[model samples]
Target chain A: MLSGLNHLTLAVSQLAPSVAFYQQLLGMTLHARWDSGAYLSCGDLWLCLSLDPQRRVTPPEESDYTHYAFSISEADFASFAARLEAAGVAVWKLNRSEGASHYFLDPDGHKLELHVGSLAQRLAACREQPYKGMVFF
Target chain B: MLSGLNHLTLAVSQLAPSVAFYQQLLGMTLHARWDSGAYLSCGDLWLCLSLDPQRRVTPPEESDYTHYAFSISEADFASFAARLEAAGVAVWKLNRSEGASHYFLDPDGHKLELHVGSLAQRLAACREQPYKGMVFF
Candidate 1:
């Protein structure tokens, strides 16, 4: 049986820029690095970004609710969004029914998010509002 | 700052089969379910499977090293691998460097993995073997 999520590995166009974005832009600490890939620590989990020129980034317009979301404290949400916007990252949002989350795209066009709540909090909020066509469970 | 990974949402072609794969095969608990999507608990983190008829499964041949790995205990590794095999899932590996990982595809062709160690353990192992064209950092 599965115990916990060990890591999520992604294909990046460039390792250096992707590393910079996750470290400088997103505040993750680089745990290890190589010519083709890098690993960063996000709380107790690891996010691995591997260079793959053949891999294509899913366009934001084409992306549905499929994405990797990170948890951010409510106090940090505003500053986090501003920092991302200042860095030239396009910050977007879900409908009000989806709760408070800042949806954005990484350098590789992979959709990422900073959600201002824990899993339990988000689940409760979703239950209250209930997005029209969205399912959070 | 970001705390950790909140959830991973993947676009699957069918909701029922995807849910069954995670819940029955992977032994994940279904947290919530709807016509369009479902959320399942993978230890502390959450895995979301969304229904997308237009979604395409990335072929194993074309898939890069991008994958989501779940931690499994050394005690459970053998039994888990046997279970997957008995279930008729095609189990494979990513080369000797990756270390004790069962690489396989879900019902939707999304690559999933069952790794038998934590980040620290993998890092230590990588230091010893040092596989070419692979990055563990």
Candidate 2:
């Protein structure tokens, strides 16, 4: 019924900061911007960040194992992690047979990840390795 | 900073029904399933449905216009809409100058969309059409 993912939208507390964090830090290109929300592209996927003053940002501990992960090349992982850390984003790690994953939170408290592999590789690790991360059952 | 989106994980009150919905109805391929959640593929992106008894489903009125849209071809649009309607899913239409969108909900009340277009096309439409949707500002 579906060919691929068209986009993912997030309810952000403030649109500007979320837009800046995604666009400047994560290399997303802004496609459209409005007082209430914005749309961006990560080369492949469209990310929609909308403002919701009443929305509460979920803390990492409070997250129900729900977060979106983006794939990064092995060559750029170090600098990307460093950039995130330099920008005051808390980064965590998950040990798996396939590779180590960098987990962090955006300014709006949305948990995001920078993983260095594909879904096929991660699923292979999930089957072979013990589940030891905040996610993964 | 990023290569592409890897997956999206959503917390649902019940995992079984959600899994059935995605796997059986949406035609997503099941990658892995555990007691806590399951991972399925929408061809291009991974969808993770996690079980969280305490997770609250956001009401339509309260939703921050945050939802995920899956891409479908123009040929399959009508049949897919009929399938959803036959399954009792409430479908809504969003008219765009470039194309149309079918918006509906999963069993858990999480908003989902079946759009017969690509991100690039939508981005182009954003520039040419006035934004009237819930999140586009």
Candidate 3:
């Protein structure tokens, strides 16, 4: 019954910084903005940054591994990391998986990633070098 | 330099049930799976269900509004609700926003919404009846 992922909303305590982080640093296009919330787009993804007084930020001490990964070109991976460094967003997790990935956090400590591969390529890798008990559709 | 949402991962405690929920119930195509995690695709979205013993499920008592919304056609909205009902998933939130929405939870209590609209449509509405202090890019 579902067509695709329409959007995902992230709760933030302060709206302005979060908005700036997403709109300015991450290069998301501002779709619409209000006092309490803002809507932005990264490619086909509609991202909602909602203002919440009691929002939960994931702990910085450990890796929960729940994150949103945006696609980046391999040629631009180095510059992308540099961009994050310039923006003062520290990398949370190093690349340890199938492709080049840089995990980081947003203003509210919400995990985000810039991944350098696509689903088709990842699936091909799985077929060539499958993980334990790996299965396909 | 980001193209779009490559994917998003959600940490789940159990592997099989989460896989079944995504692959079977939600009609997500299973890309690959291992003992630690599984990759599934719903249209353009690549979703990773990671096995994390310390994974946190959002509080059921409050509405965080941090959730993923999947697209659904208006013609199939009611039938989609029926499917959720047949699968014993209770509605988490009633429709109160811009368009038809059915908020619910997955096996791991992560919020998911089936929304019957698109960004083009929502933006049109925003222009017609923009929210407080609304601005556009």
Candidate 4:
């Protein structure tokens, strides 16, 4: 009846900066940029960034600290990195067995990650949760 | 520029029940149902249900109860209701000044709403804060 993934909505203090960061991070095109929000396409998913000034940023203890990762082609990742670097945005690098990735914060300080991998690689990574059985942190 | 919404991934509990519930409720076929998770397509967005054994089901003291809502044709609301009834599933309804709709919780206890409206209807609803001045609940 329906198709694939649609999108995720997130609130940001400023929409433009968040939109720009996601656009460059995921090689996403502008799906729709509202004065109040912005939608960016990641593969087949839409990541929504909104401007809401009245909300309080969650503190770490009670905060869910939710983060979402987007998959990107190797070439796209290069261009994305280039764009972010040129724009002077800070990116955090992740070293994984399959490949590498970087994290960035949105205008509202929500953390998001952009990774370089195939769909399979991405799926494997997503399924690979750190084994919590052995460690207590 | 992007044109449509893609998908949303939310944490859920039992995949089968959630899949069964959504399949009938939204009148959508299951994309895939896993032991720990499931995905359903409602138009352009794939609703992904993520599972965690110790997932907190209680409403967080300070968490945004974020969820997805679909924009259905005004004519199809009855059909959607009928499908759920045929499947022997319960439907949760919500009525606001803007419109009336239904709500449901996935196996993981995540909330979802299906409303009588189109994409434009969602845009209109987004124009105002339904929760007074709260950025999020």
Candidate 5:
């Protein structure tokens, strides 16, 4: 009794900085944000990064197996990687096997993947390809 | 430099059921699925459901505010809404000064939403429409 994912909300210690990070690094102009959290978008996808200090923040658990992926233009990958690296974000191994991509961490240590695609291109790809067992690779 | 959200990974207690849920409910076919986790698709976006018993899942922390979302056809909202209502998923009554049709929640407790077009549509609605601050409303 559900539908597809609309946005992934990341509960953070602070919202402003995380908002800024996604804004500057991903070029996600703040579509809408407030004290509770922020909604950042790449295209159709909407990711809500919220701030909740009252609740005990989970220490990044090893088994905490939730991560987010951000779509980037092919031309933007290198520059984004460089920027992430410059900011001292832990650089994970690049995986060409996964169809040209790389992974890294956000401010809260959530793993984020950067893949290549322009807005129109991605929409077209989605239209052309339905999900297959091998599509992720 | 991030293009947009490509795929998201979420830790699930049970893989089979989660797979069943997304496939049937979200109309997502398996893009690339494995035993530990599976990747489902809606258009260009990929949703990865994973299993990691080794590490404690990201504890439901207040500060770690991260929620997931998926897009749906405006016409499909009613069926999704029916499914959610039948399933007893707490559909958030999003105060919609925000234009675009949408819904909330799925089988998982994750707060989800559906919307028209892409984030740009939402942003534009928020900027020029009557609901200026109604984004995420």
Candidate 6:
């Protein structure tokens, strides 16, 4: 069987700027750095940033609803949004589902979200007040 | 501090096929499914496959160096690659890094990789014989 997610490797146009952005923005621990790439971690999740010659420097102009999300406590969600706003990060989309979610863009145009709920919580909520055609297994 | 990676949401052209593929190919456990998306988990990693009309139907024609990787035990590495080959999966890129890695594409053209090492192992190897310009902080 396959193990858990080992890492997410992203191709960024610039190494130094992207490194600085991820370090400051996400509070990731910088593990190692090299000429073409770096290894960083946020808790158990490893992030590998690769410097690619063919990489997009800008965020997606339209909604594709694709993103990597991080968990934030319900207690901290409000202040977290405030901090992101203070940092001048651009909000690409607003939350509309059951839980509080903040969709935003990264320096490399990757869509990301700070989400307040978990799969367990979402499953529970769906059972309590199920969405149309929702199913649990 | 942010807890960890919550989930990765991918825009798939079709929901059912993608869900079936992920379940069989990665051994992911299906948690919940709704009209628009489904939540699945591989160990601790949560995956959300959202049905999107704008999603791409084909894999990237050129190298982009972007991918999500899952770790497999070194003991199972060779057999795992054989299993993938038996399933008719295409090898998008051969391994070229310090550790063993196999890159492939999913049914929806999402880039994925199977890797056989951890951050600690990689760091130790890098220290033994550092890559050119490698830095540790």
Winning candidate number (DockQ): 3
Identify the candidate with maximal lDDT. 3
User: Which window of ten consecutive residues has the lowest lDDT sum in model 2 chain B?
Assistant: B90-99
Q: Which CAPRI quality tier does the interface of model 3 achieve? A: medium
TM-score of each: 0.89, 0.84, 0.94, 0.54, 0.69, 0.93
Model 6: pairs clashing at backbone N, Cα or C within 3 Å = A59-A109
Better of 3 and 6 by lDDT: 3
Model 6 residue B127 CA deviation in Å: 1.6
Q: Rank candidates by TM-score, best first.
A: 3, 6, 1, 2, 5, 4
DockQ for every model comes to: 0.57, 0.47, 0.78, 0.14, 0.39, 0.74
- Between candidates 5 and 6, which one is better according to lDDT? 6
Against the reference, the lDDT scores of all candidates come to 0.78, 0.76, 0.84, 0.51, 0.61, 0.83
Candidate achieving higher DockQ, 1 or 2: 1
**Candidate 2 lDDT, tens digit per residue, B47-86?**
8788987667656765545678888889998899789889
| Residue lDDT tens for model 3, A1-114 | 677799989989889999999888888898888989998888888989999887876565654667889998999988987879886896677756767788888877888888
How much does each candidate deviate from the true structure in C-alpha RMSD?
Answer: 2.8, 4.2, 1.6, 7.8, 6.1, 1.7
Model 2 ranges with Cα > 4 A deviation: A91-98, A126-137, B90-99, B132-137
The stretch of ten residues in a row with the least summed lDDT in candidate 3 chain B is B56-65
Every model's TM-score on chain B: 0.88, 0.84, 0.92, 0.62, 0.69, 0.89
Question: What are the per-residue Cα lDDT tens digits for candidate 1 across B42-120?
Answer: 8887888888876776577766667888888889988987888889986445564467888888876677888887767
Could you tell me the lDDT of residue A20 within candidate 6?
Answer: 90
Q: Residue by residue across A1-137, what tens digits does model 5's lDDT show? A: 22445556677777767887888765785767755667777665677676777434233543265667776667767887788788876754457433456777677666777766433444355446644332343
Model 4: per-residue Cα lDDT over A54-109, one tens digit each: 43554323333234556555666666656657766554334554565656545455
Candidate 1 lDDT, A1-137, residue by residue in tens? 78889889888987878888999889998866766777788898788888887767667776555578898887988899899888999755553535468889898788788876565765687688665554543
At residue B125, candidate 2 shows an lDDT of 68
Model 1 bad stretches (over 4 Å): A62-65, A92-95, A126-137, B91-94, B131-137
Clashes of 6: 1
Ranking by DockQ: 3, 6, 1, 2, 5, 4
Find the 10 residues in a row with the least total lDDT in model 2 chain A.
A128-137
